[PDB]
Amino acid sequence: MLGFLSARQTGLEDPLRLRRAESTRRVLGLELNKDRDVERIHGGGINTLDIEPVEGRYMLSGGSDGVIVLYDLENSSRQSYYTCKAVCSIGRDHPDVHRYSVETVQWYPHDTGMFTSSSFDKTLKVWDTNTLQTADVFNFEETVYSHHMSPVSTKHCLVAVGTRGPKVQLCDLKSGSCSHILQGHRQEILAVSWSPRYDYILATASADSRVKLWDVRRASGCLITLDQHNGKKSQAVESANTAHNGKVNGLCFTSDGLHLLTVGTDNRMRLWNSSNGENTLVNYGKVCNNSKKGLKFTVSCGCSSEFVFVPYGSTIAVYTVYSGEQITMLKGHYKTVDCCVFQSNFQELYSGSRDCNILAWVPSL
């Protein structure tokens, strides 16, 4: 560390070097902080967490009890110990409270004033943060497994929604248009994720073992269908070209958006080239997931090496994205881990679980 400080101060190394190497050191030293706590407000398991992209101060949380909690992650107290207090909550007495499990919650990118949340009550509700009243509701004929707003779209404000239906619903928040559908899957879409690089590229993963990349502008179907083998087992595409040997219940683009991470119920995670959907053949070992719903996992950002934090049963397994080497397994939960979300400013991780807890993992020292 002193070598790094001397190299920064004297100009030998670009300051980016110290930032990234130190962020990596902080990620490797990630450990259950009993020096930070998150206030318990969910009566049920936390399915989803979303730290706001701008300022990374506030966190959303969606529980299996249908409540939504809005936490403050800043240590406003002068103590070195603090509990991330719950600023707001869409509770059991809120007239717009979700009637069943909240399966996803997402901040509106580009601004903290609005956030969206989808539930098994077959609704995607748009919320105004400040008044904490619904601004819009998109009713679906089938329960929602996962929604996603493009983190990048300065132009369009589409929400890609995956339900048990075989079609992907695109809901335009600008004048409310929930008619657009991307058809081509055959079973429940368990995960949807817009590309962080391309405004109109959407990756959708379904229980039929297939992951498709779409260009929602295009009028001619999915761009790419991910194939495990890349052509070794090639068939006229009616049932082949599966990303996994089970359900694909998790999607995550790497930070730069040039690669796609899929996790499926074959107990595998794969890394794909997001441009041509070619498997990179990164091993990653065995990733125990048997989740019957969407599995939310995140990547690191701004480190010397990129990481992926995947829920591994009751632990959070940390892997290097581009080598497969499992960094470690963070074990502090008591039941299966449903979701983890990465605070990119301080290399902090928050993970929710079915045990009605949200655990902060902070670097040691």
Binding site: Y108, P109, H110, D111, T112, G113, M114, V126, D128, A135, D136, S153, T154, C157, L173, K174, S175, G176
Partner: protein, 270 residues
């Protein structure tokens, strides 16, 4: 539209008059005896298909070719009010030295109008679905090029729909269609890029007959269309309830989450 472009296109003026013709006494008698006929009663009871009666009434307003009544041959112009109007209009327009575009939904009615025009000394030209396709564009070219030809007899289905007939100057839609756009395109066959003379469109409806009801249906359809092509603030069609009493003869005499939220509150408050 030809209102956001027309000033930038140097098109001549346009009229869209709708004439309410009157049934003649014999045409009225046939229509009255058909609405009073038992077949209409079977239609109104759901026993028989509405299409038969609708077609019969449309034929009656076109011309009583149901019962074919010298100078009493088939399709004599004086037996139909719309043909009386057409004869007067053709007389005036011929003396005004003008070229007319005479449309009809029906091939049979087009044949009647052809026999009528040849009863006059008018020189005409006819293009329905039977005229061989290979001759249709020559026909159009002929009509557009030499002005000795006075009227152009057209079915709205072949004579509408993309053909350029700017050599025509007057256009009369002899008979309405259930579909509004058939007649919209038929009337727009004249007032196009290339029309150097003022155009007026005449739509002939028999007053108080099925034709006025078809006109009401297509006004309603046009309003439903304008609600979603030109503006969503359309005036409700109130002229009628558009029901199954059209078998009655009634001869007259990045967004920053606040524009977005504001739009949401707007949409939902409605």
């Amino acid at each position: 539209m030809k209102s956001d472009v027309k000033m930038s296109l140097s098109l001549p003026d346009k009229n869209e008059q709708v004439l309410f013709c009157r049934l003649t006494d014999e045409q009225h008698k046939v229509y009255q005896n058909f609405v009073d006929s038992k077949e209409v009663y079977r239609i109104l009871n759901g026993e028989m298909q509405i299409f038969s009666g609708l077609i019969a009434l449309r034929k009656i307003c076109n011309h009583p070719d149901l019962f074919s009544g010298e100078e009493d041959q088939f399709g004599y112009w004086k037996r139909s009010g719309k043909m009386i109007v057409v004869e007067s209009l053709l007389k005036i327009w011929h003396k005004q030295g003008q070229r007319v575009l005479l449309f009809s939904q029906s091939r049979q009615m087009l044949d009647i109008l052809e026999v009528f025009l040849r009863a006059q000394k008018y020189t005409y030209l006819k293009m329905d679905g039977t005229t061989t396709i290979a001759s249709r564009q020559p026909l159009i070219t002929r009509y557009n090029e030499d002005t000795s030809i006075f009227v152009f007899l057209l079915t709205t289905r072949v004579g509408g729909l993309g053909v350029n007939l700017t050599g025509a100057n007057r256009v009369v839609i002899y008979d309405p269609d259930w579909n509004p756009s058939t007649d919209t395109q038929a009337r727009e066959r004249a007032w196009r890029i290339g029309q150097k003379k003022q155009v007026t469109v005449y739509r002939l409806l028999t007053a108080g007959t099925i034709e006025e009801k078809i006109y009401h249906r297509q006004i309603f359809k046009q309003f439903l269309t304008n609600r979603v092509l030109k503006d969503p603030k359309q005036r409700r069609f109130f002229k009628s309830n558009d029901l199954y009493e059209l078998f009655t003869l009634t001869s007259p005499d990045p967004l920053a989450s606040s524009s977005l939220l504001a739009k949401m509150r707007a949409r939902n408050h409605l």
